[model samples]
Target chain A: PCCDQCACTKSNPPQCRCSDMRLNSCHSACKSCICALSYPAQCFCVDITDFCYEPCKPSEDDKE
Target chain B: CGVPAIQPVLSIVNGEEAVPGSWPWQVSLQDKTGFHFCGGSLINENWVVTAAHCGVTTSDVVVAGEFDQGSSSEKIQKLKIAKVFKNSKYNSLTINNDITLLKLSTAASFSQTVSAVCLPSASDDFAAGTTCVTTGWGLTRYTNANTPDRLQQASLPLLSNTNCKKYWGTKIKDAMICAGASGVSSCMGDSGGPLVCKKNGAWTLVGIVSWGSSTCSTSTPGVYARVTALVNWVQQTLAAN
Candidate 1:
């Protein structure tokens, strides 16, 4: 339901959902949003942008 | 192998000290301030491969054949970067397809301490579970600035996209490769370094250090830009530049 405006439907099986339904649109979203929506859908919102996605960074416990 | 062979040694990070000349192609990429932030691989006399996110500038310098940064030696060759070619498909949001090529202002002279790494062939696939090596000058621990004076090396066990997804969920892409185990990952300064695999007794670069856990823990394996997937783009960029 969250992925109504998502690009997943353009391809088969329709992966991806709008994790941030609260946001009017997915613009400049962080990668954390995409990771939360990764499973059951192979897609993420288009607007998620970061030079290095924050969610991908290792957690504090996981740091070197 | 265009460059003479050096026996692969397990060495840094949660790894041991690498013998001199073990990784002749390893390079240290410093920012304009002369501070090392990322690692790269010398691909040829004039070209080096790194991660696009390293944000290398034209004024940045590349130090090749460098082992100990603090130690003064004529063996280390510092070259100015003439140009940087970040892949057009590189996406900042997803960190997708993160790769870059740096052209040196002058050709690097070949020697035991400095040489070029071989690029993977179009059809070459080291396959999942292959043991590979990653080297850099990043912090040993994520929380502190325990940067090593000498370059560091670590062993990384390659993971398939599907396998890697177990740790990263759906963030894994075909253009990326995952490797490493707990407590033995690349940290902040390790980005843009090479993930190399031995093929037919020759060391060939298979990936570029893109990103991993911010903490650099063993729980999450490190991610890299799949080199075999982008050989075409790398060659094209080199030719055009």
Candidate 2:
């Protein structure tokens, strides 16, 4: 379980962070995320990590 | 339609690590040097179905019958592509008709660990709240920098196109279906993969992973290329190629 949480703008949206980041025993899932008012909503693991893949560019039709 | 020898051992976003040989129709599309970029479904021995956006060329490769990307095993087959078939109606901006097919240079040989998923007929219906499974190596969580080395599976309920509109707005087309919950959304590398539900006692391909919120949220629903709407085109393309 993560001891910390990130902020999100969504009302009552979920928040999360890495419980552990040690190399040999990396724990990537943000177990019980808490949320704040952050835009684009990252779960905010303690240390900033590189994004996993190149995200698709924002869609012109994007809504929610 | 598609049948798996070992029904997927429990399942997509925020999903569990899957058992090997489960979801035998899953395909990993990789570049020449073996870096996985996108996912696909083996629709038959000669063709693979994926998102047209993956932008694959004949030079890239497709690996079937594999699980962990970090290890090797005899259960996997790496094959070259003979051709690319992008939808003529595909629109990159709106992602309308976001589907494509790959003709394998050599037909895949069927085994316990390798098989094809059945495609749904144009009239097939998957009701809302129906349980469907999506598998991929996409980023496991929001900020995670790594995709799971072992294939990850998640069980998400199907969302009706009307219910999906609350999130995706007018962008949710008749040719697309939506699924997932807030934390169960798909991610970057999960493009062009399978989303399956049982139909007539067989695993049927319902969706080809398409577009979604850049943040990967199920509140907005992970929209997929509706297999029922496109099955006719898929059949036509396969026959002509």
Candidate 3:
């Protein structure tokens, strides 16, 4: 069972912890911790967490 | 010769479907699953400018000269990404300097519906209040459930950095530009789209779609990676690569 402060829930798939991904802290008030900027419109979740990744990564480095 | 001159077909959330061949430099960046999630602009024969946050990959395919995603035409050209070169100093958190270049596996042959857009010099400036055009396949309305099947265009007024900062707080950086009008703004899937303003009766790429408020509402202005501020970096990276 999730405590009052825990963002997790007892959903069938189980609530994923936002902090587990190194994201912002979770709160019970937040519906979901998914980052809206991290996904497409159809898949976007209201990002309640304070921090989330935007999916950018360096593909190559020429100076090296 | 550089990109040819074209008359600004004065035109968007109040955006409408774009007429084919109107924005020839518009490109769609598709993920490995063959689904497009971001828009881009053709800046040269084999180079396209996009947002660093789009997470480009060699497996991604670029579709250019496309107006309707559901329609098929010989004018449409799909090219594979050869490599991606992001600004070395890009900050992922604040999305500062969020610009990237994609090198196509094969140089695109210019056509009536496909051509590169001109790049602005580092010293060039489109002053505040300048009306510019932005194109992408993002949703038409903030509450819309899906992105448009056809390309969308909107006329956004450029806001000064100081004014934009006032609206969005300190998140507005020097290397960023803000553009949007009431009832008009870029939404999800519009990232990496081109923000071009007319210069001497010709369109010049001034910015790349970056980020905005998560709500996608007109209450907040859309931010873009200012091309003028990054022109030198783009040129230097292109030369080095």
Candidate 4:
């Protein structure tokens, strides 16, 4: 149970210690990691506080 | 070679950070001078290892069997690489078949700190979502410097072979296996190392670090030269020697 304050983080840690090993991140808050909440895609709304799905609609300029 | 320049190689033994102390099985090899490349466990004696794509610029002495991460002092094997044989058909641009072998002058001194990881004798039965670890001394970020003087390990998920081919078509050979769940995978300096899975109460050498997708992300699996396909070649080579 390393509390993120352990000295072991200097080079390599034992595991990512999270929901999955893909993202390989240890974010401090949930809102900042919406893209990483891959499992149960609906969790984007439930887990992330103050969230937006696309966040920005495709502007006219984004069209091919 | 040209495409996926910076996806990051994960050292499973040391986990996410690739820090020292935590990876008791890791070792640092300083050639005749002091150039370092990281490798991990295959067995207690024989290490199913790799020599990075660029690590071949110089041939140097390899040191194995390091236990304590803090101490630079250990029973260092200043052994010579009897032969350095790379796959004859490797394509650097597509990053396919980037594998080679370093036959140590003497066998490794096996102990708790050092040992041979068992090799897979036949087709591996490891299914998807199987958690496995990969370790090496490649770039952390695409443009960053190589991890110096220390070994790094990362935790990665085992990907199925069929799913691997859908994304990476002809590059997927009968002699190769695939890795990576999402984007993160063992990158450049990670070539020729072991992809380990435990069976019969031991970690077996399921794959050898071969190549990866053009980018580490975008759902492409890291292509590895399946050791099972080369089992006869390895056994015959080891036995004849």
Q: How far is each candidate from the true structure, as Cα RMSD in Å?
A: 9.6, 11.0, 9.5, 15.4
Q: Residues B1-241, candidate 3: write the lDDT tens digits.
A: 1234333355526787777678888999887776888889898888999988778888889998888888776478889888999878887655789898998999988887788888898998799998888888886765666678888888879999998977766567898999994568787778888899877766788989887755666766888999999989888878987
DockQ, per model, reads: 0.05, 0.03, 0.11, 0.02
Comparing 2 with 4 on lDDT, the higher-scoring candidate is 2
What fraction of the true interface does each of the listed models get right, in terms of native contacts kept? 0.00, 0.00, 0.12, 0.00
Query: What lDDT does candidate 4 reach at residue B21?
Result: 33
- i-RMS, every candidate? 11.1, 11.5, 5.0, 13.7
Give the candidate order by descending TM-score.
3, 1, 2, 4
Cα-based lDDT at residue A43, candidate 4: 12
Q: Judged by DockQ cut-offs, is candidate 3 incorrect, acceptable, medium or high?
A: incorrect
List the candidate 2 regions with Cα displacement exceeding 4 Å.
Answer: A1-64
Question: For candidate 2, lDDT tens digit of each residue in B1-241?
Answer: 4667776667245678887878888999989878787899999999999987678899889999888888865568999999999999987545668899999999999888899999888987799999988888777765666667888888889998888887656556788898886468777678788899988889899998876655565555787889898889999998888
Name the better of 2 and 3 by DockQ: 3
lDDT of 2 at B191: 78
Model 3 whole-model lDDT (C-alpha atoms): 0.73
Best of the two (1, 3) by TM-score: 3
Worst lDDT window (10 residues) for model 4 chain B? Answer: B1-10
